[PDB]
């Protein structure tokens, strides 16, 4: 009931009593682990209200009082008599960062408390959508100077008015099938890519083109919109050594802002939420440029190299990855935008744990997302045990849109 | 019920039926995943279920389920359980349990040759001098001249837990480390506290970088012995690297043999906790762990230094840089040598290939994915991107306490 986690490497232990807490389900049962998995009313409402409200108070140290006490009457008022209810600017903002204090697969959780909120529930139509993103976008790329922020449409009502932004990132590049059968551009994005065009896109069908905005407000049809170019601020990608790098073309793009999860605070549903951060090294030049099914240039590179690819024992794979990875990561630092090491954020995420385990008695951690995708054992995390398990409020997944939309 | 795994790579889904025949724990709950957690006298009450859990497995596998050798062997169990409080496994069944432990070691990357291994029964052992000569024969065969063969030797089981047979040693082959007066640590830092045991024992230390550190015994629960593996046992490999010349000057070296002795192997519900199991390096044991780790030889810095890498921001990757030339060199080094080794990209290519099979064929592979990803380069193996279900079997090889924080000693 009382649990300890050992970091291995320093001999470290710590006790995780948050996990008591802990209100929803893991996929994991006593019979059987599944944390490699990548995703396993009225009545119903009011304890959820309550739940949340409760901490709130306690956060802002007047658990019990009246503020409290009338907070929760009030909301409870509002519940028996709209079937919803509203959270105060406050709360909601309470709520968004504690979302995020609970991402268990974010290793960048050390940033939490300094969180941008941009309320849009005032926001109606896509165009208004359009308008939020945009200053979302603007503020939180600030010339380079990357800041964390999430901005947030109105809630969910009869599941019939929902707000979504179809894209899965704000900004991401279009990916197209080629007659030769191969692939142009970000494979990943080839079904969105599809839909946009279907829905009007003028795609130019080049190799890096930002994709369209795909916005539904109040459950109405989803329309396009081009990000202001001006606004995506995109970084070439060269190498500090290998003047040939710039050649192989490659550019990526400075925010990371992701769109499509459904942020739930307090029983309510925010199914638009973008929000945005800065990107770590790893997960542009690891799995953006070198996954299989992604722009995949490690051939390529390692061709450039001259390496031996005659036999895998040569670890020319793994030579051409840190050679890309050194090259994003020098790209950013030259163009002066922000950027995190994976050595670093891992142990920014260590220092950050710790201080969890000190100050709330506990860290929600997926140690099969917290450890980067190259180098793991050389950073702290891989030898921190890590418990896992879901607290509100949360980022949660979401059915992606055209599957669900009514048109 | 059925369950999906996925690859994210592939779009390769499967489906897992064979977790329905798992028993024990895996230390989740429906409100927590200790996934990444490292660590989660017997009476014939509960004995003979797992005898005869046993033995109906062992059957179906020989297609004699429901066999008059099969009924007749489930009696011959019985009796001789609440006649004796245990029972003896005949050499098929012992074998058929080694594999099959092995088969479902789910943090097992190596699986795939999971048929292939030999057994050597050592339950006649009834000294640590027979223990010696067991473990020096099992060390010479599975050696074989650098042309590695994977077996086990498995010494009797426990009976009153009181005449454990243990061997000490976490590995039957690994280096000493000796922690200095001024706080640093001579040799292989993971072995400071079993090197000290076995001096106290009377272990004269050599006390070098790379001293082989000597096998202590304990044989039915008496005081444990020490023996010096014979050196022309003992198979090592200098390191060097293909393109840098300096990297012989580092002066390193290691054994060819990875060769696990502090497991417990659980067949039948019958413990056997001595049962030293041996096969050949994957690459990043030594190169990433071994040498790399922090807690251990921490090379990273000086190879980093020698290649002039710029070390003053970890943002140049010089650590990755460094980390990748070492594991260039411990392959090289290997099969230069003629000495059986895999890199991290074909064994984890295999072991996918393994695994899908277990699937088509057995229902599924349990599978500690935190443990499968090697520790370098994670996402370019094909693993990374496989969705992978943990769960427990038996026959298995379980942790268990090490022998001297619950030894009664002797004199
Ligand atoms: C500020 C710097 C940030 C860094 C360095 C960072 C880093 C990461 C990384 C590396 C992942 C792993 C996902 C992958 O590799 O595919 C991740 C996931 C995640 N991050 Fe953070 N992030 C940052 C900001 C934020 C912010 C501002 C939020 C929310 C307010 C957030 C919420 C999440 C969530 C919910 C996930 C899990 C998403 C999923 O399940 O796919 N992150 N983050
Ligand atoms: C033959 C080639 C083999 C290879 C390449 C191999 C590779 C590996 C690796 C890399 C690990 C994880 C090690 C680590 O944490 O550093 C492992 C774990 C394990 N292997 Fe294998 N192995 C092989 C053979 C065997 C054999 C013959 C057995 C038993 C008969 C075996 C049983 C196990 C067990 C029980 C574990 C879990 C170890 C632990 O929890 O500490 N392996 N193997
Ligand atoms: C804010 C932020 C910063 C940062 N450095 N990295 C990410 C991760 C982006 C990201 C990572 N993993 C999965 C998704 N998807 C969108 C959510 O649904 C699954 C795919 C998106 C987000
Ligand atoms: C047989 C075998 C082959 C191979 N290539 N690699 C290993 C490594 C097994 C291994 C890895 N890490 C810790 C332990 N220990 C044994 C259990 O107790 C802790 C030490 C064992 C074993
Ligand atoms: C905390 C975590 O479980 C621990 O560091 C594990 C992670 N994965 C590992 N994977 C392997 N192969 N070997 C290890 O020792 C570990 N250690
Ligand atoms: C199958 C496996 O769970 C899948 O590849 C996961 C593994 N770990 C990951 N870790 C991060 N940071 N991001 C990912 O997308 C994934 N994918
Ligand atoms: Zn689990």
Redesign the interface.
């Known amino acids: 009931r009382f649990?300890k986690?050992?970091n291995?490497?320093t001999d470290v232990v710590l006790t995780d009593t948050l996990?008591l807490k802990?209100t929803l389900?893991?996929?994991?049962?006593?019979?059987?682990?599944?944390?490699?998995?990548?995703l396993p009313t009225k009545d119903q409402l009011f304890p959820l209200a309550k739940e949340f409200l409760d901490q709130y108070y306690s956060s802002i140290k007047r658990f019990g009082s009246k503020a409290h006490m009338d907070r929760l009457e009030e909301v409870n008022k509002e519940i028996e008599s709209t079937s919803t209810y509203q959270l105060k600017d406050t709360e909601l903002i309470y709520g968004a960062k504690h979302a995020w204090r609970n991402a268990s697969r974010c290793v960048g959780r050390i940033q939490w408390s300094k969180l941008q909120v941009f309320d849009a529930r005032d926001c109606t139509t896509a165009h208004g959508m359009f308008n939020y993103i945009c200053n979302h976008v603007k503020y939180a790329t600030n010339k380079g100077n990357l800041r964390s922020a999430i901005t947030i449409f109105p809630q969910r009502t009869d599941g019939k008015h929902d707000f979504r932004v179809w894209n899965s990132q704000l900004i991401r590049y279009a990916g197209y099938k080629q007659p030769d059968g191969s692939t142009l551009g970000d494979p990943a994005n080839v079904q969105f890519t599809e839909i946009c065009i279907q829905q009007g896109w003028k795609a130019p069908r080049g190799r890096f083109d930002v994709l369209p905005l795909l916005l539904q407000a109040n459950g109405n049809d989803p329309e396009l919109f081009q990000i202001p170019p001006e606004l995506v601020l995109e970084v070439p990608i060269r190498h500090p050594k290998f003047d040939w790098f710039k050649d192989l073309g490659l550019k990526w793009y400075g925010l990371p802002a992701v769109s499509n999860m459904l942020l739930e605070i307090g029983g309510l549903e925010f199914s638009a939420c973008p929000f945005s951060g800065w990107y770590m090294?790893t997960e542009i030049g690891?799995?953006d440029y070198?996954?299989?099914?992604r722009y995949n240039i490690?051939e390529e590179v390692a061709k450039k190299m001259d390496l031996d690819m005659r036999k895998?024992?040569?670890?020319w794979?793994?030579?051409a990855?840190?050679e890309i990875?050194?090259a994003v990561?020098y790209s950013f630092?030259s163009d002066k935008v922000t950027i995190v090491?994976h050595?670093?954020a891992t142990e920014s995420f260590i220092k950050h744990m710790e201080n969890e385990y000190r100050c709330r008695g506990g860290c929600p951690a997926?140690?099969?997302w917290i450890?980067?995708?190259?180098?793991?054992?050389?950073t702290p995390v891989?030898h921190q045990?890590?418990?896992?398990?879901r607290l509100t409020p949360s980022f949660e997944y979401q059915p992606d849109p055209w599957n669900t939309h009514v048109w």
Do not use: A
Request: proline fraction near 3%.
């Open positions: 649990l986690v050992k291995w490497e996990h802990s389900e893991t996929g994991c049962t006593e019979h059987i682990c599944m944390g490699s998995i990548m090294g690891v799995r070198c996954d299989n099914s490690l895998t024992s040569s670890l794979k793994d030579q990855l840190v990875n050194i990561l630092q090491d050595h670093s997926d140690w099969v450890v980067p995708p190259m180098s793991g054992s050389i891989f045990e890590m418990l896992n398990y």
